[PDB]
Design a protein around this ligand. Sequence first.
Ligand SMILES: [Mg+2]
Ligand SMILES: [Mg+2]
Ligand SMILES: [Mg+2]
Ligand SMILES: [Mg+2]
Ligand SMILES: [Mg+2]
Ligand SMILES: [Mg+2]
Ligand SMILES: [Mg+2]
Ligand SMILES: [Mg+2]
Ligand SMILES: [Mg+2]
Ligand SMILES: [Mg+2]
Ligand SMILES: [Mg+2]
Ligand SMILES: [Mg+2]
Ligand SMILES: [Mg+2]
Ligand SMILES: [Mg+2]
Ligand SMILES: [Mg+2]
Ligand SMILES: [Mg+2]
Ligand SMILES: [Mg+2]
Ligand SMILES: [Mg+2]
Ligand SMILES: [Mg+2]
Ligand SMILES: [Mg+2]
Ligand SMILES: [Mg+2]
Ligand SMILES: [Mg+2]
Ligand SMILES: [Mg+2]
Ligand SMILES: [Mg+2]
Ligand SMILES: [Mg+2]
Ligand SMILES: [Mg+2]
Lengths: 109, 175, 249, 201, 190, 139
Amino acid sequence: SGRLWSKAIFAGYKRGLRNQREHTALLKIEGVYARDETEFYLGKRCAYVYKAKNNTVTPGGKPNKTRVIWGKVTRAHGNSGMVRAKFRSNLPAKAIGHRIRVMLYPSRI
Amino acid sequence: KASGTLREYKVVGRCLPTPKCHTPPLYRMRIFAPNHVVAKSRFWYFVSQLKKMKKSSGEIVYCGQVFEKSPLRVKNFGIWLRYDSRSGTHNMYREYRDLTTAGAVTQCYRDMGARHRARAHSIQIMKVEEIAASKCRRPAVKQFHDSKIKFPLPHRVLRRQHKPRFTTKRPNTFF
Amino acid sequence: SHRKFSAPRHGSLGFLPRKRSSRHRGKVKSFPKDDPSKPVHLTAFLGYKAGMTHIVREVDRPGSKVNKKEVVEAVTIVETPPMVVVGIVGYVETPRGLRTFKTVFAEHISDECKRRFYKNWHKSKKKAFTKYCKKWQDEDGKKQLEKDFSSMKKYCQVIRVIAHTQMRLLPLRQKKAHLMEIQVNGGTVAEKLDWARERLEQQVPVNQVFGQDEMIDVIGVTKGKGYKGVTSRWHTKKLPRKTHRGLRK
Amino acid sequence: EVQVLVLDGRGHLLGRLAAIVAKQVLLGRKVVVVRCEGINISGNFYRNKLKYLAFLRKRMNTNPSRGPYHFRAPSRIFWRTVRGMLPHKTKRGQAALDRLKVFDGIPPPYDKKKRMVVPAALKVVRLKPTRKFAYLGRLAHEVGWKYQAVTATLEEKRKEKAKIHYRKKKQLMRLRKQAEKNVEKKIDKYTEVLKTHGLLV
Amino acid sequence: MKTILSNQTVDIPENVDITLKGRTVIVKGPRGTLRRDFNHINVELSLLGKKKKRLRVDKWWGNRKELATVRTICSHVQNMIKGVTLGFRYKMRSVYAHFPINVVIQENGSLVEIRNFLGEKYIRRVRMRPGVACSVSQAQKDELILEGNDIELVSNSAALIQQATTVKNKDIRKFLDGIYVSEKGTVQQA
Amino acid sequence: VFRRFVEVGRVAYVSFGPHAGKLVAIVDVIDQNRALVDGPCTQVRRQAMPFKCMQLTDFILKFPHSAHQKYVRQAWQKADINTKWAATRWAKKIEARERKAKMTDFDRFKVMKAKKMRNRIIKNEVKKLQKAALLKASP
RNA sequence: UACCAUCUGUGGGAUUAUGACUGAACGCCUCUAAGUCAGAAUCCCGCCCAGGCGGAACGAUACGGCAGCGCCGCGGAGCCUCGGUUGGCCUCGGAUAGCCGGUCCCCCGCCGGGGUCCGGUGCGGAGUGCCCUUCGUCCUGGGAAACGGGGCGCGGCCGGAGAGGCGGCCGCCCCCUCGCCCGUCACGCACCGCACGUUCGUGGGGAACCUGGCGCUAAACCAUUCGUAGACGACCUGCUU
RNA sequence: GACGUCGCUUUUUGAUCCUUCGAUGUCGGCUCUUCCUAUCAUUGUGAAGCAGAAUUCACCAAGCGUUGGAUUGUUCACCC
RNA sequence: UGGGCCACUUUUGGUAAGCAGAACUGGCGCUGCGGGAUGAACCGAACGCCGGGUUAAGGCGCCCGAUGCCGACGCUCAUCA
RNA sequence: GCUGGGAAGGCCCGGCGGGGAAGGUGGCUCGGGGG
Ligand SMILES: [Mg+2]
Ligand SMILES: [Mg+2]
Ligand SMILES: [Mg+2]
Ligand SMILES: [Mg+2]
Ligand SMILES: [Mg+2]
Ligand SMILES: [Mg+2]
Ligand SMILES: [Mg+2]
Ligand SMILES: [Mg+2]
Ligand SMILES: [Mg+2]
Ligand SMILES: [Mg+2]
Ligand SMILES: [Mg+2]
Ligand SMILES: [Mg+2]
Ligand SMILES: [Mg+2]
Ligand SMILES: [Mg+2]
Ligand SMILES: [Mg+2]
Ligand SMILES: [Mg+2]
Ligand SMILES: [Mg+2]
Ligand SMILES: [Mg+2]
Ligand SMILES: [Mg+2]
Ligand SMILES: [Mg+2]
Ligand SMILES: [Mg+2]
Ligand SMILES: [Mg+2]
Ligand SMILES: [Mg+2]
Ligand SMILES: [Mg+2]
Ligand SMILES: [Mg+2]
Ligand SMILES: [Mg+2]
């Protein structure tokens, strides 16, 4: 019943032109295209959810094929939406262009 | 000398009092500068070109911003300037419409950079004064000298071209 | 630097990949342009090269030196028995070109036509178009077929007739027939469609396709010579007699 | 947003539309661009034609069949501009280039959908009105595209069908207004709720 | 330098009726009707009178290059008004030294054929623009009269014919043969 | 064509800037891009303003150019604009826009229920209307 | 096999230089500024040659035996494997120095087109938009409905060809007056603060088992011949009537 | 186009010595393809001290063509 | 180690040269990194292995991080911009 | 806090007033369109 997370897109890693830093991720959240709108999402949890072959244990449920890399939004990256986030493990490069959930967790509203 | 929006300063200075003339004369300039440090630098430049006086054997007895006397009345401004191109240097007289003297001088700086590719270190402003409407020469100001002036805003180009970035309806320019 | 004496290009670059033809028949690749003011007619035919001989005729060319005198000219003889129209294909023109919309074949297609459809007629069961002529003789299949005709009439822009040669009238070893699409020109699509379905399952002679003393085009496959060198293949100049690793290079 | 984004190319400037499309298609977002024959290019027709003919001149003189392929359709010209703005020698750029699809005219999975517009690439927004421009369809047709007449007739058919559908929609809207005027006395309780919270001026 | 307003006005006679569907002028005098689309120029056009019928064109923040177009549009509309009131006629005379230029007018004044231009055997045929009628004059001997309502069509047809009869590989200071526009008048002369 | 003009006394609507969403009277014109500007009854003191930031309305006040604030203020008050505007439908369109922005969650629920029922009633009446309008049997 | 014999060798478009038309700038003039014209061994295309890790239409689709295959089932039970995704928008043409909507009088075999007239225009008949909206049941009222809802239930008809793979309407019968809004009444694992929950989805692909009804019973390659072909492959042919 | 003066080119010859001396086969011709244009001819033009014919000077233009010989190893040259 | 080479400014021969020869300082050689698309020497800055923050030079349509600012004022149309 | 102990600006029909002018208001003269 109902979505309860905002949809973002893994846009790429933090980088200059010829050096990329894979510990920080760049996220484009749908609907926000300025810094003073990115202010709401500034400490929210975020998740890269994906499927694989083997079964993993699910908290409060039965084992299935879904896996999650957890992270959180850390700050804004440049004048038009585009936050930068920090995950527990660095995100795989096959996730670029794909969906990342922003979870409305720890709440300040 | 770079820019911004300019302020007008009056800088008053003098040579240092030697035990030959115990009271050297004071000199005063109106100087359009980004800040008072640039104002004092330009003062020493101009007064060193005019009088045999340098920053070492001299002092600034006053450096203070001239506020605009009537910043709510639209005035005409005549600027007498000199500058130098890639070839030799030229005298010039420009006219502007503005609320502030420093605003008109800033307008003159951006205009000289636009039309003659002249840099601020090339420009020297030598006179700036408030012209009435019936004494102006330039048609770009005399066309605004009209009491019953009236014009539309014909072709309103959309500016928020990215909010939204994808719409379903094409914009309208007539309003 | 500067090849020092002008000579033109040996051979033509408008003719190359200079490879074996992928077909044996000879594709038209361009039919005549359609104008609906003309009557309905065919635009091509399929013959067989018999041989050559020569003729004697009297020329009527005013101002020419051979005016009202007799000349001898070589001729080529092409045997053209009448072609059997057995099918009809329609084409619609799209922004990607011109695609085939719908083909309709006829009942009772001949064995040389089915021979064209098979690669080994000896070991086959000869089952081609049997379920199709079933739907021709049926009545539920019959209303389906006229629905296809009506849809072709209301949508297609180019119709062509599938006709085969009848090889039993030829002195050749080949019993397998040659099929061909021949564009139908000169009318509305409805007019040429009823005309072609009138001519369906039927013989068309070269007397009806072509006429006396008109100028036509011949499309075919050039006589085969095999792997040749540059002197035969491009007619380059032979190198002098004292050339170490070969002259014909 | 997990649906396809369908843009109408008519009235848009080539490189600006290509840049917008390229960033979208790298970020995800399957994009269809229809009516690529209506795309405009700034600068006059002759100098745009000369730019294309210089491109046609660029040819691998040892093997032109191996050389650069000069596509002629306006859809493929737009596609090659987006290809030039993409990182197409990588798997990511190739996946984005596959995520993009372009068409001449409007083919019929998309003729019965709503087409969007990118105002940052529109000619009326990005060019002064006293400036020359060219048409991608005319440019393509004069550099060797074969299919501008068939596309024009199919577009005329599509416009007739769209006029019929639009007249149906207008009759439905008139009926809905009539129905509001009929039963306003039983929706007056609900109408004032919507007016209170900013819907229904 | 952008002038705030540049404008000027065309008077309209009583027997003409003009309509403005935007930047599209339809002129409706007695000799027919004309229509011209000016949607390549950013001006505004307005009808003023109810019994005097002035037409203003306005430019509103243009520079020099687009302030020219004001007077150009007004002159085009005045040529339309003249074309529907009086109609344009171009009288062009045939000029030859030795070989007489034989002009024959095929169907209903819409085709002209010049036969013996400079003694050549090639027959040149010029198609008139639609709405322009050519004829041989009766008052003077070797003279074409080509008439119409559109000045652009009539003058382009005259220039077509004139550049058709042209001399090649010879001295065009001698060899002065051709057909040249002698005068650009009207019909009904009032 | 061109029903609205930049002139002295023309009332414009400031749409963005520090004075966004405001009403403004044009006092004078400063050189093709700015206007001397004063809203004394809408709490905007006199300054220069870009034509890119202002949008022209249909109200024109009556005072000579470069007049003082008391003159523009009493010209605003005699035939006050704060009642002509706001009961113009541009202004209540803005007002509806901002209350729709301020609409809360429980309000959103009530709007959903009301709009759902209203659409049900309108849709049923539309169905009845077209099924009655199909009663056509004339030669 | 030879200019050492014989045959065949082609059409348009935009335009370049140039020559002009109307016509300002500059109350005159001016091929030029806006707008038009003619224009070539050039250029592009046709014609002709090849035919894409590019498509299309159509044919035939495996036993005399246990022997396969296809279709109609949600018809069932399961296995592996690839994972994305987490409501929909079912559509005028367009203009931008202008648009959009609705009506009274003319015309088109009683709908569409004009001319009035009336609205709106920082687009509210609004993509900053619109439509759907999900905790579920039980007693009990009120209006909304009553000309209804739901049958992967039957049959028929019409429209869609550019890539139609779709959409719409009638007749037969079978269940409910429930579902939409405001209320009354209580109950459900209320799993004791905690993550991958929530859809698309009966997803896609691949083997295998059971279960019925309707059907179908082929080709290709080799070998062999041919010589219109050919280095070899390839290619063109024939083989109980 | 004198006296002067501004350039371009790398089809001349110099100047230089950066690459190559555990090796880049060193003149010319023959053969064959492609490119350039600073156009000799041909297409379309403008100018002339362009009457015609012939010629000269320019422009768009490199699509197409630019030969057979005597002498010389010759590139160049010169003649038929 | 006693083959040096390059750059601002000064400077000799030479028409000049990515030529030859000096002075002064810095570099490269012996040196990676950010920028100059690419590059011994330019511009920034010199380096143990990492996290956070911020910068230089340089940028911010898309490739490609960053203007998706309702940025400011002008100039400019190029049939080799 | 400082500044020209900020400059401008608001209100007090600022009041006795004194002048001055045009990007010239009213009133007048002339020219055009609506009873
Ligand atoms: Mg040569
Ligand atoms: Mg030997
Ligand atoms: Mg004139
Ligand atoms: Mg001559
Ligand atoms: Mg021969
Ligand atoms: Mg020209
Ligand atoms: Mg032309
Ligand atoms: Mg032509
Ligand atoms: Mg050397
Ligand atoms: Mg050296
Ligand atoms: Mg060596
Ligand atoms: Mg070696
Ligand atoms: Mg070797
Ligand atoms: Mg070698
Ligand atoms: Mg040239
Ligand atoms: Mg060629
Ligand atoms: Mg040594
Ligand atoms: Mg040195
Ligand atoms: Mg060393
Ligand atoms: Mg060191
Ligand atoms: Mg270093
Ligand atoms: Mg670097
Ligand atoms: Mg560089
Ligand atoms: Mg760091
Ligand atoms: Mg960059
Ligand atoms: Mg970026």
